[PDB]
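User: Predict structure, ligand bromide ion.
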Amino acid sequence: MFNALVVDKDEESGKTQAAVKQLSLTDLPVGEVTVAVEYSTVNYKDGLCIGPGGGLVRKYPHVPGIDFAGTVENSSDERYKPGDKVVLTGWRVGEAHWGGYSQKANVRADWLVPLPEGLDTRQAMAVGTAGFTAMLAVMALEDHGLTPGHGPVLVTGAAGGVGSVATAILAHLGYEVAAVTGRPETADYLTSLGATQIVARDEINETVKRPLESEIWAGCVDAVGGAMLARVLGQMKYGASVAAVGLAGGAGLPATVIPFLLRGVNLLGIDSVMQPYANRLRAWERIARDLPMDKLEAMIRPATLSDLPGLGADILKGQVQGRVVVDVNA
Amino acid sequence: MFNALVVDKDEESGKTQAAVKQLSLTDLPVGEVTVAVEYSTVNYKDGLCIGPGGGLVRKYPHVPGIDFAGTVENSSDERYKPGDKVVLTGWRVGEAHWGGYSQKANVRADWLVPLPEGLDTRQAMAVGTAGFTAMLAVMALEDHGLTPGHGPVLVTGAAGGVGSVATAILAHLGYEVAAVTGRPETADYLTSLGATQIVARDEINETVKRPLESEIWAGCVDAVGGAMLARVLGQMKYGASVAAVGLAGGAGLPATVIPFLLRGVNLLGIDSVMQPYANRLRAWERIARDLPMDKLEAMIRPATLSDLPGLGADILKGQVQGRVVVDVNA
Ligand SMILES: [Br-]
Ligand SMILES: [Br-]
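Assistant: Predicted complex:
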């Protein structure tokens, strides 16, 4: 038997409860590949799936965790054999299916990627969906003409999970990074990832009546959304793009069409969940090459399965800095 | 001396009046190239500059008209000489600078493009800023993977200027074009341009509480904006893109970020005004090749300078179908 985080729900009442529990192999859903999980992580979505559910989990009891990395235990699929190191992000694992907060996980072989060269299973989850999303965002900006030397790139929610990898990848590629945070004590941490400028959240988290402001940002990785994304749109330089990745600041988008029409701005939707295999390999290769491992190490916060109920709650309130690494075998 | 439409402003009350007037060459602002204008047209913005101004005109008296085409009369720039057929769209002509609603116009040589192969000056203005914008929208969707055979492409405000041209281009390139209109009597016109479905404005002109609806549209050219654009974002297929082109339905964009995050949807800003020389040539070549001239002809509504006050009022109310062609020399 083995350890896993299990969420139960009281349907009469609707309340949920998450606890570490012992399971057997036969309690897992059947699948092509069985992985002995070595590491997982905590994303904002995991926070939802650990606690309230946010309408993302449709079957209880539930093992959350949208990410994991580990070693293949058994497989009925040619692509993977016992011993192979593999990473799982997204594919609705941790939401529609049992996920990574477990010493063992069963998945479809289509959902896995080989462990990328230059990362171990621990760093792969230090990156996680948050870091993978950050790389997809940077790639979207590059595909739309972003190159260093044409103004600061804004990174909202910069001290969080997506923001910390975004900041470090962009800094390492040679960009000037303007890191947004509502908590000024995070400045030294952000500067140590490579932030050049620190923007206060309260400068930029309300809409204003003017549909256009002074052109400032050469690009943006938006891990916040909400009113702040609406306000940010009116401050992008002509022809610059914003990569939308986050909704912690709220799902609503109180924007105007004026930045798009008058300044040729783009709002680019970043989805990590359903990324095709080939693009997953490309983004992971870019992370291997463009995210300095010592910068990733400075983000890492260790945790066990027992910590997950507290960490899940904390990340929903924006009180988790950097990237949590869950040693499911600790 | 020669004829032009002049708008006067009564800055006390703030109300304007437009009328045909006789100018001399010396009344025109100085510039590098003098063009004997042959044709202009009526864009939504021209309606603003003809009438109330919409914050776009900062010096009266004002000759409006953001577009014109004709023959170079004199030139102090080596790029153009007497006799060259030239086309003007945008560059803030008709807004910041006296425009095409005149038998003669002075411009910077930087603002002109040679008359494109396959169009005469009349057809260039039947296309106009509106059609130029529609091609840029089609090009933006292509650059993001739009290709025939994967669903209908929505064109909002289909019976207007941008919408008519976009419809005909997309239909000629082999797409199924879903054409939005509030005027059901215009179905036969839209079918004649190549629309394969007619969609009623009232089905899609309000937001709904759900942030995602069923995936329908392979892409969109949006000449309306406002609530309709917010509603359309939630109906786009995974990874599909919207080319934002218009604001006749309102400048406010009451959207959510959910389509961008969950479906990888893009909102691509189309700016015609400041497009660089090289891309203008590319887009005009595409128009000459992919807008069938007989479809363009079916859009044409003839007009003279004296028609401009009424048409300017008409286009602001959504009461102009197709594309006006102004013979400034009739
Ligand atoms: Br923030
Ligand atoms: Br419409």
